[PDB]
Amino acid sequence: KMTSFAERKKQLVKAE
Amino acid sequence: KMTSFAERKKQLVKA
Amino acid sequence: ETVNVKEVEIIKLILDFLNSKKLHISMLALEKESGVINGLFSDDMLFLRQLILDGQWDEVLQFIQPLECMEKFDKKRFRYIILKQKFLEALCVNNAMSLEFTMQEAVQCLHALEEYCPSKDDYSKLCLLLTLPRLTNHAEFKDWNPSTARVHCFEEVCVMVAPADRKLSEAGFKASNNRLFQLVMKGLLYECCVEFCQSKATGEEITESEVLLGIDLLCGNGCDDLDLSLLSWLQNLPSSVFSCAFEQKMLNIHVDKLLKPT
Amino acid sequence: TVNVKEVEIIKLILDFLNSKKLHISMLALEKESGVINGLFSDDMLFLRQLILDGQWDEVLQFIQPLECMEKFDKKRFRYIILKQKFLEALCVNNAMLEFTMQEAVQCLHALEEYCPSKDDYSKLCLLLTLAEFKDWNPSTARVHCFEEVCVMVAEFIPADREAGFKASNNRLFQLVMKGLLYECCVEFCQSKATGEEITESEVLLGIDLLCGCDDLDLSLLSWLQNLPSSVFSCAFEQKMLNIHVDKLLKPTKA
Numbered sequence: 216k217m218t219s220f221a222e223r224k225k226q227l228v229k230a231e
Numbered sequence: 232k233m234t235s236f237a238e239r240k241k242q243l244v245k246a
Numbered sequence: 247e248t249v250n251v252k253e254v255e256i257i258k259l260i261l262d263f264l265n266s267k268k269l270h271i272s273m274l275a276l277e278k279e280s281g282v283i284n285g286l287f288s289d290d291m292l293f294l295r296q297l298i299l300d301g302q303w304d305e306v307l308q309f310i311q312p313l314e315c316m317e318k319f320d321k322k323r324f325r326y327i328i329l330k331q332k333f334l335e336a337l338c339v340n341n342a343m344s345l346e347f348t349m350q351e352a353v354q355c356l357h358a359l360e361e362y363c364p365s366k367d368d369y370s371k372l373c374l375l376l377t378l379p380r381l382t383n384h385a386e387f388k389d390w391n392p393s394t395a396r397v398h399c400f401e402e403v404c405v406m407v408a409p410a411d412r413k414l415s416e417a418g419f420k421a422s423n424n425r426l427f428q429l430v431m432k433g434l435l436y437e438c439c440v441e442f443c444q445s446k447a448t449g450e451e452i453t454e455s456e457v458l459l460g461i462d463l464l465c466g467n468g469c470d471d472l473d474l475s476l477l478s479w480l481q482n483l484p485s486s487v488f489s490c491a492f493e494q495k496m497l498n499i500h501v502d503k504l505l506k507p508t
Numbered sequence: 509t510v511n512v513k514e515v516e517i518i519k520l521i522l523d524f525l526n527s528k529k530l531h532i533s534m535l536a537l538e539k540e541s542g543v544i545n546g547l548f549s550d551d552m553l554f555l556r557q558l559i560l561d562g563q564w565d566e567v568l569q570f571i572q573p574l575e576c577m578e579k580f581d582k583k584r585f586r587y588i589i590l591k592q593k594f595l596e597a598l599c600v601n602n603a604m605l606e607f608t609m610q611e612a613v614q615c616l617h618a619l620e621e622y623c624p625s626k627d628d629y630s631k632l633c634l635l636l637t638l639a640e641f642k643d644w645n646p647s648t649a650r651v652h653c654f655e656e657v658c659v660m661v662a663e664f665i666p667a668d669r670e671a672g673f674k675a676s677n678n679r680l681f682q683l684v685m686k687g688l689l690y691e692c693c694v695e696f697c698q699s700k701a702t703g704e705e706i707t708e709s710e711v712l713l714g715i716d717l718l719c720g721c722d723d724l725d726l727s728l729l730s731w732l733q734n735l736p737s738s739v740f741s742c743a744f745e746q747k748m749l750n751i752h753v754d755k756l757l758k759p760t761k762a
Contacts, residue, residue: 237447239444249685433686442729466679490734500509501513
């Protein structure tokens with residue numbers, strides 16, 4: 216499994 | 232002012 | 247290069263922690279001593295809270311009766327909760343008297359609760375508890391405190407009553423669920439990262455397991471602790487490793503739970 | 509795969525309550541959790557709970573086996589014990605069945621033979637007419653009394669040792685601030701990786717103490733792991749860090 220800072224940022228901003 | 236990171240460990244050790 | 251923090255918010259954090267660990271006597275002591283309450287309730291919600299925490303059940307009933315004839319106001323469950331707490335307190339007074347009239351009071355509370363009970367089986371369980379020499383001899387009511395039960399009753403009542411409060415700029419902050427434990431673990435991770443960066447630069451590159459097993463929650467190696475080194479280090483740094491895909495390992499915590507005295 | 513004990517967290521909270529002198533809450537938490545911040549022998553803990561629960565004659569009977577020793581000041585110990593007893597008696601008398609003035613006068617003349625100077629006792633005699641030094645809280649007074657007797661009885665009552673069970677000093681504050689800085693660092697790393705401009709003052713202002721509900725994970729640690737070892741020694745300014753602490757609005761009721 217791989218994840219990036221940009222991926223986490225987009226996961227957070229697309230969840231409000 | 233000051234620029235160091237590897238020196239931070241030594242400065243903390245000097246105590 | 248300056249940060250402002252409020253001690254009242256730290257006390258709100260530790261209040262949330264005490265509530266999460268069912269240390270409600272400590273929580274009430276801390277509230278009445280420091281004056282702070284985690285959350286912003288109405289001027290009448292504070293009165294309802296003080297009534298519930300002091301055992302003024304008849305006053306609580308006469309206080310919400312103006313809200314009886316409403317719409318989504320579940321008066322059945324509200325009166326059930328109130329009268330059930332009243333009956334359990336009368337029962338705890340009765341079984342510890344061993345008498346006088348506390349048995350009469352317990353049976354009167356049981357008859358008053360006879361109607362608002364959600365099911366006849368729960369009423370049978372209540373009348374069965376009435377017989378036991380200690381209501382704590384039941385698996386469900388084994389660990390049952392008056393203070394914790396009153397706090398749970400207030401938490402269940404406010405969620406149904408809320409029915410307003412005054413809006414403010416930033417005076418309405420609560421403490422998020424398990425915020426102090428989260429901040430403590432994040433500070434421990436900050437210490438781990440600072441140690442990993444000070445050691446990796448200082449030659450010996452240990453595996454990430456080393457800095458995680460080197461966690462010390464009680465004693466802190468950093469006397470000043472905040473050097474503000476990690477932020478300024480990230481400041482002047484090439485922006486290519488920020489777009490570097492990394493591993494998504496999960497953080498496994500094992501909590502040694504508290505052994506509360508009975 | 510880490511180990512976290514709630515007892516250590518409660519010790520941090522105890523240290524924080526002692527730093528702000530919230531001793532009623534500290535004692536309530538000690539009693540409700542069974543946790544004591546610090547190392548103490550089985551006898552020192554007994555003396556501690558005797559002093560905290562207000563058992564002064566029992567304390568005097570407990571420490572009497574040590575008054576016969578040479579290197580001991582049996583004059584100041586009884587002095588402070590009977591002084592705290594007399595102050596608590598005067599306070600419980602000041603409350604609006606009364607026979608407590610007899611006990612107050614008895615506790616006063618019980619410590620007359622133990623004061624260092626006579627003018628101090630003379631001033632103490634004037635307290636029966638009232639509140640001239642009203643930071644005197646019984647819980648705080650009992651804690652100070654236990655500390656002042658422990659800094660002298662521990663020579664005969666050994667600690668059975670190290671101080672590896674004490675919750676340090678202000679450690680809860682340090683860990684909270686470090687968690688805030690971890691949140692700042694992760695918001696910075698997310699910003700400069702998603703194509704957003706960012707500076708140092710904005711991430712410092714973006715501190716949400718009560719909670720930006722960024723969940724907890726070791727993502728930054730894995731990013732440090734999978735990052736080359738040739739950039740971990742850079743040149744950056746060691747900034748002037750200051751934390752203004754809005755102190756407590758301690759109410760007036762007891």
